[PDB]
Amino acid sequence: VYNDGYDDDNYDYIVKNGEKWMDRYEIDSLIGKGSFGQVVKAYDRVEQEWVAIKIIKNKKAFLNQAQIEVRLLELMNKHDTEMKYYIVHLKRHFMFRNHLCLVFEMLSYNLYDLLRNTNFRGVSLNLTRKFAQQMCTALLFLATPELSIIHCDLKPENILLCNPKRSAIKIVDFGSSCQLGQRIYQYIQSRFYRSPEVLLGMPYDLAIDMWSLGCILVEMHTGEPLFSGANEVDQMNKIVEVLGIPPAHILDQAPKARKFFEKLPDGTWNLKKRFEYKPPGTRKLHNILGVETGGPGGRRAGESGHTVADYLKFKDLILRMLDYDPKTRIQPYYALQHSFFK
Ligand SMILES: O=c1c2c(O)cc(O)cc2oc2c(O)ccc(O)c12
């Protein structure tokens, strides 16, 4: 028996629908599970509203990580400006029967759920544009110097709708997040959304989030992951099928560059060693998006906001996001100036 019988064998609190907490919270049900513990829907009898409570595991490591998350949300929740309103709001935090608990505003489903309710056909380029603009604003919030927060784990599942009918979104789950100051694994981000500098074991900064955003937007419009690596080597190879071989001057300083590429005698780089990939740069984003053939699936011929001209703007913005060079990858302020948004 664990924690006087309240935990199970994974350090997870045993959620019992209906329980009341501190004479304040009525636990409704489980809505989420992860390596950190659980998320319940709960009714805050005092404020008279539903909340999402995140119940960290009763175990020292996860508690220390979650304490990082809390300081980072308390830092964000110190800032005036209304950019902060695309980050999920921390309502409070407390210890309960040995678990650190984070009370959040209650939201609706995440964008991977939204994709499944379309049967992975994707949402329209207009909906994607509105998601893009919210997300860049949210990254611009994180970049403000006092914060300089890497989320470190952007993907559809961590972008939630506010309300199932509107298109407002907030970013959740700052449990793997860090400030420019702090760090570390280099094994961060989910594989499909992992920046190349992370794969090559280079130093990363806030720019890695902007890579993940690039891949998320494309996936939201086509329905399928742009780069679905089944492991690090496959990941980098799927990237290279689209963006070609990464600049020499970056590979020249990439600790794990020889995990994927051979330096030819002459100093230029190529891929290594029977179904081959597609030649570098040959699966062109132009055909993935369907720029000239009715958007993904042909399904958008003649729709409004999906003229070839809108698709060229989109492709431009994504490529600027999928820059290999993290010092020239488009930054939040300038993604918002792009003609995709005007
Ligand atoms: O913060 C989270 C969260 C939230 O703030 C509101 C909500 O309606 C759901 C949520 O679901 C999560 C999850 O499944 C994993 C990790 C998280 O941090 C969250």
mmCIF file of C-alpha atoms and ligand atoms in Angstrom:
data_model
loop_
_atom_site.group_PDB
_atom_site.id
_atom_site.type_symbol
_atom_site.label_atom_id
_atom_site.label_comp_id
_atom_site.label_asym_id
_atom_site.label_seq_id
_atom_site.Cartn_x
_atom_site.Cartn_y
_atom_site.Cartn_z
ATOM 1 C CA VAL A 1 0.000 0.000 0.000
ATOM 2 C CA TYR A 2 1.275 3.432 -1.118
ATOM 3 C CA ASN A 3 0.886 6.899 0.416
ATOM 4 C CA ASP A 4 -1.551 5.519 3.028
ATOM 5 C CA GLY A 5 -3.398 3.875 0.138
ATOM 6 C CA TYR A 6 -3.973 7.036 -1.936
ATOM 7 C CA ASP A 7 -1.311 6.323 -4.603
ATOM 8 C CA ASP A 8 -0.992 3.310 -6.885
ATOM 9 C CA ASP A 9 2.246 1.621 -7.881
ATOM 10 C CA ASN A 10 3.224 4.325 -10.432
ATOM 11 C CA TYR A 11 3.186 7.175 -7.842
ATOM 12 C CA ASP A 12 -0.135 8.260 -9.409
ATOM 13 C CA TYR A 13 -2.933 9.400 -7.090
ATOM 14 C CA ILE A 14 -5.939 7.071 -7.476
ATOM 15 C CA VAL A 15 -8.610 9.421 -8.832
ATOM 16 C CA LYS A 16 -12.084 8.594 -7.489
ATOM 17 C CA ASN A 17 -14.853 10.426 -9.337
ATOM 18 C CA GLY A 18 -16.856 12.508 -6.866
ATOM 19 C CA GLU A 19 -14.237 13.082 -4.157
ATOM 20 C CA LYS A 20 -14.007 16.499 -2.521
ATOM 21 C CA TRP A 21 -10.755 18.253 -1.683
ATOM 22 C CA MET A 22 -10.103 20.914 0.916
ATOM 23 C CA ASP A 23 -13.870 21.435 0.934
ATOM 24 C CA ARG A 24 -13.255 23.254 -2.318
ATOM 25 C CA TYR A 25 -12.732 20.908 -5.290
ATOM 26 C CA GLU A 26 -15.066 18.161 -6.487
ATOM 27 C CA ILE A 27 -13.102 15.734 -8.668
ATOM 28 C CA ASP A 28 -15.149 14.876 -11.752
ATOM 29 C CA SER A 29 -13.102 12.591 -13.947
ATOM 30 C CA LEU A 30 -9.832 11.834 -15.718
ATOM 31 C CA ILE A 31 -9.078 13.794 -18.865
ATOM 32 C CA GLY A 32 -5.394 13.287 -19.177
ATOM 33 C CA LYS A 33 -2.428 11.077 -18.525
ATOM 34 C CA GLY A 34 1.267 11.472 -19.038
ATOM 35 C CA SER A 35 4.640 10.717 -17.581
ATOM 36 C CA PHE A 36 4.095 13.548 -15.005
ATOM 37 C CA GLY A 37 0.888 12.055 -13.567
ATOM 38 C CA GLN A 38 -2.756 12.820 -14.316
ATOM 39 C CA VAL A 39 -5.135 15.609 -15.280
ATOM 40 C CA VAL A 40 -8.649 15.692 -13.832
ATOM 41 C CA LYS A 41 -11.646 17.833 -14.618
ATOM 42 C CA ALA A 42 -12.826 19.289 -11.301
ATOM 43 C CA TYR A 43 -15.459 21.721 -10.035
ATOM 44 C CA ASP A 44 -14.083 24.618 -7.924
ATOM 45 C CA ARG A 45 -17.055 25.102 -5.609
ATOM 46 C CA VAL A 46 -15.603 28.349 -4.299
ATOM 47 C CA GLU A 47 -15.167 30.210 -7.574
ATOM 48 C CA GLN A 48 -18.089 28.285 -9.095
ATOM 49 C CA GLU A 49 -16.263 27.042 -12.170
ATOM 50 C CA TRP A 50 -14.795 23.931 -13.752
ATOM 51 C CA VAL A 51 -11.017 23.664 -13.575
ATOM 52 C CA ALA A 52 -8.356 21.303 -14.903
ATOM 53 C CA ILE A 53 -6.119 19.948 -12.143
ATOM 54 C CA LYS A 54 -2.767 18.391 -12.959
ATOM 55 C CA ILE A 55 -1.731 15.848 -10.327
ATOM 56 C CA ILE A 56 2.040 15.364 -10.420
ATOM 57 C CA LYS A 57 3.380 11.989 -9.327
ATOM 58 C CA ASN A 58 4.338 11.517 -5.665
ATOM 59 C CA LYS A 59 8.045 11.185 -6.469
ATOM 60 C CA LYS A 60 10.958 13.552 -6.119
ATOM 61 C CA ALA A 61 12.000 13.960 -9.767
ATOM 62 C CA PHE A 62 8.569 14.748 -11.191
ATOM 63 C CA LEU A 63 7.894 17.109 -8.285
ATOM 64 C CA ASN A 64 11.147 18.999 -8.962
ATOM 65 C CA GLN A 65 10.282 19.261 -12.676
ATOM 66 C CA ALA A 66 6.765 20.476 -11.917
ATOM 67 C CA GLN A 67 8.226 23.034 -9.520
ATOM 68 C CA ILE A 68 10.143 24.350 -12.548
ATOM 69 C CA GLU A 69 6.858 24.621 -14.472
ATOM 70 C CA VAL A 70 5.276 26.547 -11.612
ATOM 71 C CA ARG A 71 8.013 29.180 -11.379
ATOM 72 C CA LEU A 72 7.794 29.589 -15.152
ATOM 73 C CA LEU A 73 4.012 30.096 -15.074
ATOM 74 C CA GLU A 74 4.269 32.443 -12.074
ATOM 75 C CA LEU A 75 6.839 34.393 -14.108
ATOM 76 C CA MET A 76 4.536 34.546 -17.124
ATOM 77 C CA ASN A 77 1.614 35.369 -14.871
ATOM 78 C CA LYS A 78 3.585 38.516 -13.787
ATOM 79 C CA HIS A 79 3.220 40.209 -17.220
ATOM 80 C CA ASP A 80 0.626 42.789 -18.385
ATOM 81 C CA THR A 81 0.129 42.290 -21.876
ATOM 82 C CA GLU A 82 -2.345 40.402 -23.594
ATOM 83 C CA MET A 83 -0.007 38.181 -25.536
ATOM 84 C CA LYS A 84 0.044 36.181 -22.224
ATOM 85 C CA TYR A 85 -3.533 35.253 -23.134
ATOM 86 C CA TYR A 86 -2.441 32.447 -25.523
ATOM 87 C CA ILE A 87 -0.650 30.680 -22.669
ATOM 88 C CA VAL A 88 -2.791 28.495 -20.446
ATOM 89 C CA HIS A 89 -3.347 30.334 -17.181
ATOM 90 C CA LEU A 90 -2.235 28.803 -13.859
ATOM 91 C CA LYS A 91 -5.019 29.521 -11.375
ATOM 92 C CA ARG A 92 -3.265 28.132 -8.324
ATOM 93 C CA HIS A 93 -0.974 25.401 -7.042
ATOM 94 C CA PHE A 94 -0.852 23.546 -3.734
ATOM 95 C CA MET A 95 0.262 20.279 -2.165
ATOM 96 C CA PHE A 96 -2.400 17.617 -1.600
ATOM 97 C CA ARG A 97 -1.726 14.279 0.105
ATOM 98 C CA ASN A 98 1.916 14.501 -1.132
ATOM 99 C CA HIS A 99 1.177 15.484 -4.777
ATOM 100 C CA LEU A 100 1.911 18.882 -6.255
ATOM 101 C CA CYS A 101 -1.272 19.980 -8.054
ATOM 102 C CA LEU A 102 -1.624 22.643 -10.711
ATOM 103 C CA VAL A 103 -5.038 24.193 -11.161
ATOM 104 C CA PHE A 104 -5.606 25.527 -14.646
ATOM 105 C CA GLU A 105 -8.403 27.179 -16.513
ATOM 106 C CA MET A 106 -10.493 24.437 -18.089
ATOM 107 C CA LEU A 107 -10.156 24.214 -21.903
ATOM 108 C CA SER A 108 -11.433 21.969 -24.719
ATOM 109 C CA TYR A 109 -9.741 19.502 -26.935
ATOM 110 C CA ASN A 110 -6.347 19.763 -28.449
ATOM 111 C CA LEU A 111 -5.476 20.189 -32.107
ATOM 112 C CA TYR A 112 -4.659 16.536 -32.633
ATOM 113 C CA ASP A 113 -8.231 15.770 -31.566
ATOM 114 C CA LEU A 114 -9.443 18.432 -33.986
ATOM 115 C CA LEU A 115 -7.519 16.663 -36.799
ATOM 116 C CA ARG A 116 -9.155 13.292 -36.002
ATOM 117 C CA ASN A 117 -12.649 14.805 -36.164
ATOM 118 C CA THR A 118 -11.845 15.715 -39.794
ATOM 119 C CA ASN A 119 -10.615 12.126 -40.489
ATOM 120 C CA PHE A 120 -7.106 13.504 -41.018
ATOM 121 C CA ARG A 121 -8.112 15.607 -44.029
ATOM 122 C CA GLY A 122 -7.011 18.712 -42.184
ATOM 123 C CA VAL A 123 -8.611 22.027 -41.466
ATOM 124 C CA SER A 124 -8.831 24.870 -43.960
ATOM 125 C CA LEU A 125 -5.981 27.252 -44.685
ATOM 126 C CA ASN A 126 -8.140 29.974 -43.091
ATOM 127 C CA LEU A 127 -8.375 28.095 -39.837
ATOM 128 C CA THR A 128 -4.643 27.367 -40.071
ATOM 129 C CA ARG A 129 -3.919 31.041 -40.630
ATOM 130 C CA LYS A 130 -5.787 31.930 -37.408
ATOM 131 C CA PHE A 131 -3.953 29.165 -35.528
ATOM 132 C CA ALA A 132 -0.645 30.360 -36.950
ATOM 133 C CA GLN A 133 -1.238 33.919 -35.881
ATOM 134 C CA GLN A 134 -2.217 33.028 -32.321
ATOM 135 C CA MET A 135 0.827 30.726 -32.026
ATOM 136 C CA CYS A 136 3.364 33.281 -33.287
ATOM 137 C CA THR A 137 1.932 35.789 -30.875
ATOM 138 C CA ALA A 138 2.337 33.221 -28.095
ATOM 139 C CA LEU A 139 5.934 32.576 -29.139
ATOM 140 C CA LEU A 140 6.517 36.334 -29.240
ATOM 141 C CA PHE A 141 5.305 36.458 -25.666
ATOM 142 C CA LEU A 142 7.759 33.785 -24.651
ATOM 143 C CA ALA A 143 10.622 35.576 -26.366
ATOM 144 C CA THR A 144 10.292 38.788 -24.323
ATOM 145 C CA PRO A 145 13.686 39.005 -22.594
ATOM 146 C CA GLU A 146 12.634 38.704 -18.959
ATOM 147 C CA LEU A 147 11.139 35.278 -19.807
ATOM 148 C CA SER A 148 13.118 33.802 -22.741
ATOM 149 C CA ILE A 149 11.239 30.533 -22.354
ATOM 150 C CA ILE A 150 11.590 27.529 -24.645
ATOM 151 C CA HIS A 151 8.417 25.493 -24.459
ATOM 152 C CA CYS A 152 10.476 22.534 -25.726
ATOM 153 C CA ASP A 153 7.496 20.338 -26.545
ATOM 154 C CA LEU A 154 5.204 21.969 -29.085
ATOM 155 C CA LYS A 155 2.924 19.607 -30.986
ATOM 156 C CA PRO A 156 -0.825 19.445 -31.770
ATOM 157 C CA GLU A 157 -1.546 17.713 -28.418
ATOM 158 C CA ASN A 158 -0.213 20.712 -26.428
ATOM 159 C CA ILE A 159 -2.247 23.288 -28.341
ATOM 160 C CA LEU A 160 -5.827 23.264 -26.992
ATOM 161 C CA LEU A 161 -8.969 25.025 -28.182
ATOM 162 C CA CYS A 162 -10.540 27.382 -25.651
ATOM 163 C CA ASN A 163 -14.054 26.425 -26.636
ATOM 164 C CA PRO A 164 -15.028 23.771 -29.224
ATOM 165 C CA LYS A 165 -16.927 26.281 -31.396
ATOM 166 C CA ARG A 166 -14.458 29.224 -31.600
ATOM 167 C CA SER A 167 -10.838 29.127 -32.889
ATOM 168 C CA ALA A 168 -9.075 30.650 -29.884
ATOM 169 C CA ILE A 169 -6.194 28.383 -28.725
ATOM 170 C CA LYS A 170 -3.865 28.351 -25.743
ATOM 171 C CA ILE A 171 -0.570 26.506 -25.340
ATOM 172 C CA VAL A 172 -0.418 24.010 -22.448
ATOM 173 C CA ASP A 173 2.146 21.799 -20.697
ATOM 174 C CA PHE A 174 5.228 23.730 -19.657
ATOM 175 C CA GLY A 175 6.645 20.669 -17.852
ATOM 176 C CA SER A 176 9.589 20.242 -20.223
ATOM 177 C CA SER A 177 10.045 24.028 -20.531
ATOM 178 C CA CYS A 178 13.200 26.037 -19.733
ATOM 179 C CA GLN A 179 14.537 29.584 -19.793
ATOM 180 C CA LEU A 180 17.505 30.361 -21.991
ATOM 181 C CA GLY A 181 19.425 30.098 -18.816
ATOM 182 C CA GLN A 182 18.459 26.590 -17.762
ATOM 183 C CA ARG A 183 18.715 23.242 -19.786
ATOM 184 C CA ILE A 184 18.917 19.809 -20.520
ATOM 185 C CA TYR A 185 18.448 16.879 -22.141
ATOM 186 C CA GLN A 186 19.285 17.377 -25.714
ATOM 187 C CA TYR A 187 16.596 14.870 -26.397
ATOM 188 C CA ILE A 188 13.725 17.239 -26.187
ATOM 189 C CA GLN A 189 10.658 17.882 -28.386
ATOM 190 C CA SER A 190 8.647 14.952 -29.724
ATOM 191 C CA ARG A 191 10.418 13.305 -32.622
ATOM 192 C CA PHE A 192 8.152 14.573 -35.456
ATOM 193 C CA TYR A 193 8.651 18.158 -34.286
ATOM 194 C CA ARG A 194 12.282 18.013 -33.241
ATOM 195 C CA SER A 195 14.484 20.795 -34.578
ATOM 196 C CA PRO A 196 17.589 19.795 -36.521
ATOM 197 C CA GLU A 197 19.903 21.540 -34.173
ATOM 198 C CA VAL A 198 18.496 19.301 -31.419
ATOM 199 C CA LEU A 199 18.984 16.186 -33.479
ATOM 200 C CA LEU A 200 22.600 17.133 -34.192
ATOM 201 C CA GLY A 201 23.225 17.843 -30.523
ATOM 202 C CA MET A 202 23.908 21.533 -31.043
ATOM 203 C CA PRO A 203 23.016 24.283 -28.567
ATOM 204 C CA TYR A 204 19.391 25.279 -28.970
ATOM 205 C CA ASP A 205 17.507 28.454 -28.038
ATOM 206 C CA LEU A 206 13.939 29.744 -28.457
ATOM 207 C CA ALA A 207 14.216 29.090 -32.149
ATOM 208 C CA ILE A 208 13.454 25.369 -31.744
ATOM 209 C CA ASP A 209 9.821 26.158 -30.885
ATOM 210 C CA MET A 210 9.546 27.967 -34.190
ATOM 211 C CA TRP A 211 10.621 24.797 -36.017
ATOM 212 C CA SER A 212 7.904 22.819 -34.242
ATOM 213 C CA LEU A 213 5.382 25.492 -35.270
ATOM 214 C CA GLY A 214 6.449 25.102 -38.901
ATOM 215 C CA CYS A 215 5.694 21.352 -38.793
ATOM 216 C CA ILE A 216 2.460 21.840 -36.841
ATOM 217 C CA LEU A 217 0.921 24.294 -39.334
ATOM 218 C CA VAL A 218 1.655 22.016 -42.324
ATOM 219 C CA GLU A 219 0.181 19.028 -40.455
ATOM 220 C CA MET A 220 -2.904 21.041 -39.485
ATOM 221 C CA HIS A 221 -3.620 21.816 -43.139
ATOM 222 C CA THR A 222 -2.698 18.472 -44.760
ATOM 223 C CA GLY A 223 -3.798 16.245 -41.879
ATOM 224 C CA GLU A 224 -0.591 14.244 -41.713
ATOM 225 C CA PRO A 225 2.781 14.855 -40.047
ATOM 226 C CA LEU A 226 5.174 16.589 -42.362
ATOM 227 C CA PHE A 227 8.208 14.641 -41.062
ATOM 228 C CA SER A 228 7.131 11.344 -39.404
ATOM 229 C CA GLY A 229 10.470 9.907 -38.276
ATOM 230 C CA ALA A 230 10.251 6.567 -36.495
ATOM 231 C CA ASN A 231 13.675 7.379 -34.908
ATOM 232 C CA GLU A 232 16.362 10.063 -35.023
ATOM 233 C CA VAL A 233 17.977 8.723 -38.207
ATOM 234 C CA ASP A 234 14.616 8.413 -40.033
ATOM 235 C CA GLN A 235 13.635 11.877 -38.713
ATOM 236 C CA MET A 236 16.678 13.613 -40.230
ATOM 237 C CA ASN A 237 16.203 11.665 -43.404
ATOM 238 C CA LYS A 238 12.549 12.714 -43.782
ATOM 239 C CA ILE A 239 13.658 16.326 -43.202
ATOM 240 C CA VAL A 240 16.365 16.014 -45.869
ATOM 241 C CA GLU A 241 13.881 14.677 -48.427
ATOM 242 C CA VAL A 242 12.237 18.115 -48.190
ATOM 243 C CA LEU A 243 14.896 20.690 -47.317
ATOM 244 C CA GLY A 244 18.022 19.106 -48.794
ATOM 245 C CA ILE A 245 21.343 18.732 -47.035
ATOM 246 C CA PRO A 246 21.962 21.157 -44.149
ATOM 247 C CA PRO A 247 24.466 23.954 -44.817
ATOM 248 C CA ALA A 248 28.078 22.875 -44.563
ATOM 249 C CA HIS A 249 28.991 25.555 -42.049
ATOM 250 C CA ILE A 250 26.391 24.204 -39.629
ATOM 251 C CA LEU A 251 27.337 20.580 -40.087
ATOM 252 C CA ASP A 252 30.985 21.535 -39.570
ATOM 253 C CA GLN A 253 30.111 22.269 -35.939
ATOM 254 C CA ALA A 254 27.493 19.573 -35.294
ATOM 255 C CA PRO A 255 28.668 17.036 -32.632
ATOM 256 C CA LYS A 256 26.347 14.377 -34.136
ATOM 257 C CA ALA A 257 26.711 15.341 -37.808
ATOM 258 C CA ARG A 258 28.421 12.012 -38.573
ATOM 259 C CA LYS A 259 25.442 10.172 -37.133
ATOM 260 C CA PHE A 260 23.644 11.144 -40.372
ATOM 261 C CA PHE A 261 26.128 12.514 -42.946
ATOM 262 C CA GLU A 262 29.492 11.584 -44.459
ATOM 263 C CA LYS A 263 32.016 14.344 -45.107
ATOM 264 C CA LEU A 264 33.349 13.692 -48.573
ATOM 265 C CA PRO A 265 37.151 13.982 -49.062
ATOM 266 C CA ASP A 266 36.586 17.392 -50.780
ATOM 267 C CA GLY A 267 34.857 18.744 -47.631
ATOM 268 C CA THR A 268 31.237 18.769 -48.798
ATOM 269 C CA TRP A 269 28.614 16.795 -46.930
ATOM 270 C CA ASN A 270 26.309 14.042 -48.078
ATOM 271 C CA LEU A 271 24.055 11.422 -46.598
ATOM 272 C CA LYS A 272 25.396 8.034 -45.635
ATOM 273 C CA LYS A 273 24.776 4.422 -46.746
ATOM 274 C CA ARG A 274 17.744 -0.870 -49.929
ATOM 275 C CA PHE A 275 14.693 1.333 -50.652
ATOM 276 C CA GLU A 276 16.293 4.723 -50.777
ATOM 277 C CA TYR A 277 14.940 7.966 -49.493
ATOM 278 C CA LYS A 278 13.992 10.546 -51.949
ATOM 279 C CA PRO A 279 16.916 12.628 -53.265
ATOM 280 C CA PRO A 280 17.607 15.650 -51.043
ATOM 281 C CA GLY A 281 15.095 18.413 -51.673
ATOM 282 C CA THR A 282 12.843 16.421 -54.011
ATOM 283 C CA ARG A 283 9.670 15.960 -51.982
ATOM 284 C CA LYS A 284 8.866 19.612 -52.408
ATOM 285 C CA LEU A 285 6.601 21.399 -49.936
ATOM 286 C CA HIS A 286 4.972 22.781 -53.106
ATOM 287 C CA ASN A 287 3.505 19.317 -53.775
ATOM 288 C CA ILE A 288 2.755 18.431 -50.179
ATOM 289 C CA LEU A 289 0.604 21.575 -49.914
ATOM 290 C CA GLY A 290 -0.919 21.164 -53.387
ATOM 291 C CA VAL A 291 -0.157 24.809 -54.285
ATOM 292 C CA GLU A 292 -1.415 24.466 -57.865
ATOM 293 C CA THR A 293 -3.713 21.439 -57.655
ATOM 294 C CA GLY A 294 -6.347 22.514 -55.149
ATOM 295 C CA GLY A 295 -4.505 22.325 -51.841
ATOM 296 C CA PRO A 296 -4.088 19.056 -49.985
ATOM 297 C CA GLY A 297 -6.209 16.288 -51.483
ATOM 298 C CA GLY A 298 -7.459 18.504 -54.273
ATOM 299 C CA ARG A 299 -10.195 19.277 -51.796
ATOM 300 C CA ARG A 300 -9.842 23.145 -51.827
ATOM 301 C CA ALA A 301 -10.118 24.058 -55.535
ATOM 302 C CA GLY A 302 -11.866 27.387 -55.723
ATOM 303 C CA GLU A 303 -12.173 27.947 -51.998
ATOM 304 C CA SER A 304 -11.571 31.382 -50.759
ATOM 305 C CA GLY A 305 -8.285 32.099 -48.981
ATOM 306 C CA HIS A 306 -6.851 29.102 -50.939
ATOM 307 C CA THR A 307 -5.890 30.830 -54.195
ATOM 308 C CA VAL A 308 -2.522 29.776 -55.566
ATOM 309 C CA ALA A 309 -1.426 33.170 -54.248
ATOM 310 C CA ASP A 310 -2.446 32.345 -50.674
ATOM 311 C CA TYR A 311 -0.650 28.975 -50.965
ATOM 312 C CA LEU A 312 2.584 30.572 -52.151
ATOM 313 C CA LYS A 313 2.473 32.932 -49.175
ATOM 314 C CA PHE A 314 1.925 29.890 -46.886
ATOM 315 C CA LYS A 315 4.808 27.897 -48.361
ATOM 316 C CA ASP A 316 7.048 30.936 -47.993
ATOM 317 C CA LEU A 317 6.164 31.328 -44.355
ATOM 318 C CA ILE A 318 6.689 27.633 -43.584
ATOM 319 C CA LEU A 319 10.087 27.493 -45.322
ATOM 320 C CA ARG A 320 11.153 30.496 -43.265
ATOM 321 C CA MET A 321 10.112 28.456 -40.251
ATOM 322 C CA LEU A 322 11.924 25.348 -41.502
ATOM 323 C CA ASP A 323 15.200 27.204 -41.965
ATOM 324 C CA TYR A 324 18.087 24.918 -40.975
ATOM 325 C CA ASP A 325 20.028 27.894 -39.593
ATOM 326 C CA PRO A 326 18.604 28.767 -36.137
ATOM 327 C CA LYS A 327 20.065 32.248 -36.263
ATOM 328 C CA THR A 328 18.129 33.109 -39.472
ATOM 329 C CA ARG A 329 14.941 31.131 -38.923
ATOM 330 C CA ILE A 330 12.092 33.591 -38.877
ATOM 331 C CA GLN A 331 11.460 35.001 -35.444
ATOM 332 C CA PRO A 332 8.027 35.679 -33.873
ATOM 333 C CA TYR A 333 7.806 39.430 -34.480
ATOM 334 C CA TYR A 334 8.568 38.987 -38.186
ATOM 335 C CA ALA A 335 6.393 35.949 -38.783
ATOM 336 C CA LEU A 336 3.480 38.242 -37.853
ATOM 337 C CA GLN A 337 4.580 40.785 -40.533
ATOM 338 C CA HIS A 338 4.428 38.112 -43.243
ATOM 339 C CA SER A 339 1.936 38.502 -46.074
ATOM 340 C CA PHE A 340 0.280 35.254 -44.994
ATOM 341 C CA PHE A 341 -1.459 37.267 -42.242
ATOM 342 C CA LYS A 342 -2.135 40.744 -43.759
HETATM 343 O O1 LIG B 1 -2.115 21.998 -18.685
HETATM 344 C C1 LIG B 1 -2.960 21.030 -19.239
HETATM 345 C C2 LIG B 1 -4.420 21.253 -19.480
HETATM 346 C C3 LIG B 1 -5.058 22.450 -19.194
HETATM 347 O O2 LIG B 1 -4.233 23.431 -18.647
HETATM 348 C C4 LIG B 1 -6.442 22.561 -19.465
HETATM 349 C C5 LIG B 1 -7.107 21.472 -20.013
HETATM 350 O O3 LIG B 1 -8.473 21.513 -20.326
HETATM 351 C C6 LIG B 1 -6.447 20.312 -20.304
HETATM 352 C C7 LIG B 1 -5.120 20.188 -20.042
HETATM 353 O O4 LIG B 1 -4.546 18.948 -20.356
HETATM 354 C C8 LIG B 1 -3.179 18.678 -20.172
HETATM 355 C C9 LIG B 1 -2.590 17.442 -20.509
HETATM 356 O O5 LIG B 1 -3.397 16.432 -21.072
HETATM 357 C C10 LIG B 1 -1.259 17.243 -20.279
HETATM 358 C C11 LIG B 1 -0.522 18.208 -19.741
HETATM 359 C C12 LIG B 1 -1.021 19.426 -19.400
HETATM 360 O O6 LIG B 1 -0.135 20.365 -18.860
HETATM 361 C C13 LIG B 1 -2.390 19.726 -19.601
#
